[PDB]
Amino acid sequence: MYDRWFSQQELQVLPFAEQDEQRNQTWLELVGEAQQLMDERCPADEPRAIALATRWMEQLEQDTAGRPEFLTRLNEMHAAEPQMREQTGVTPEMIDFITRAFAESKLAIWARYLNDEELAFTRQHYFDRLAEWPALVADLHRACREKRDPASPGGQQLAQRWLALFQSYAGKDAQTQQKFRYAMEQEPHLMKGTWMTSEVLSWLQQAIGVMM
Numbered sequence: 001m002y003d004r005w006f007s008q009q010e011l012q013v014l015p016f017a018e019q020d021e022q023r024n025q026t027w028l029e030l031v032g033e034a035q036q037l038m039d040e041r042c043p044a045d046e047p048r049a050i051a052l053a054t055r056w057m058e059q060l061e062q063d064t065a066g067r068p069e070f071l072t073r074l075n076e077m078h079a080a081e082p083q084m085r086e087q088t089g090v091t092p093e094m095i096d097f098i099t100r101a102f103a104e105s106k107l108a109i110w111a112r113y114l115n116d117e118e119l120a121f122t123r124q125h126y127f128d129r130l131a132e133w134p135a136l137v138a139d140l141h142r143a144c145r146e147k148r149d150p151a152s153p154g155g156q157q158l159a160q161r162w163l164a165l166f167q168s169y170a171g172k173d174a175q176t177q178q179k180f181r182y183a184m185e186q187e188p189h190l191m192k193g194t195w196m197t198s199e200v201l202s203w204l205q206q207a208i209g210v211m212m
């Protein structure tokens with residue numbers, strides 16, 4: 001199944017391919033527990049749901065080798081592979097539940113940095129363009145590997161896309177955006193589930209610097 005979507009060279013470095021049992025048992029537990037919460041009508045802002053969603057993103061980043069290009073590949077499979085549902089037990093409805101629960105874990109943090117109106121805006125618009133982040137993070141990793149110049153046209157285009165996705169949920173207000181960047185500096189959890197590394201983040205912030 002994975003062969004239809006990953007090269008055999010990629011399958012060597014893709015933890016999903018190896019037979020480990022602790023890795024399989026870990027996902028049997030995470031999926032079984034997600035379906036149980038959904039059966040119980042558990043809301044996404046429930047501590048159990050939030051805790052599960054965080055563990056879900058931690059494990060998913062580990063088992064993609066921190067490679068966002070593999071994350072984007074799995075999302076291609078969930079949309080295009082009919083076997084994904086039966087093979088993994090992960091449904092599109094389940095992903096929507098985990099996505100909302102993980103977002104709630106960050107909104108719980110942002111509520112300390114934002115006012116009631118700012119938070120209300122972000123809670124509504126956080127999901128507008130959320131699914132486009134993995135494709136951007138993969139291009140950022142690529143630009144970093146290839147030693148692309150942040151000031152080059154291509155590098156500024158990546159900075160522009162980051163700004164587009166960031167303003168989507170933070171808004172255009174300069175003061176409000178400052179709060180987000182300050183929270184990002186103080187809260188390590190806010191950088192979970194991003195596939196971002198200090199090296200890429202450093203490349204991104206040079207590109208944003210030139211854009212200013």
Ligand SMILES: COc1c(NC(=O)c2ccc(NC(=O)c3ccc(N4C(=O)C[C@H](NC(=O)c5ccc(NC(=O)/C(C)=C/c6ccc(O)cc6)cc5)C4=O)cc3)c(OC)c2O)ccc(C(=O)O)c1O
Pocket residue numbers: 016024027028031060071074075087088089090095098099130131132133134137166180181182184193194195196205
């Ligand atoms: C704003 O802050 C900043 C930032 N920020 C950022 O750079 C930043 C970067 C990135 C993000 N986001 C993301 O990366 C980001 C990740 C992900 C999604 N995602 C969704 O939600 C839905 C969608 N699917 C999934 O999730 C999904 C879930 C589960 C699976 N399971 C499986 O397949 C299988 C098969 C399992 C299995 C089971 C059994 C087996 O037997 C075998 C297998 C599959 C798929 C998706 O992919 C979406 C997004 C981000 O957040 C928005 C960021 O903010 C930078 C600088 C400053 C500054 O200060 O300069 C700053 O302030």
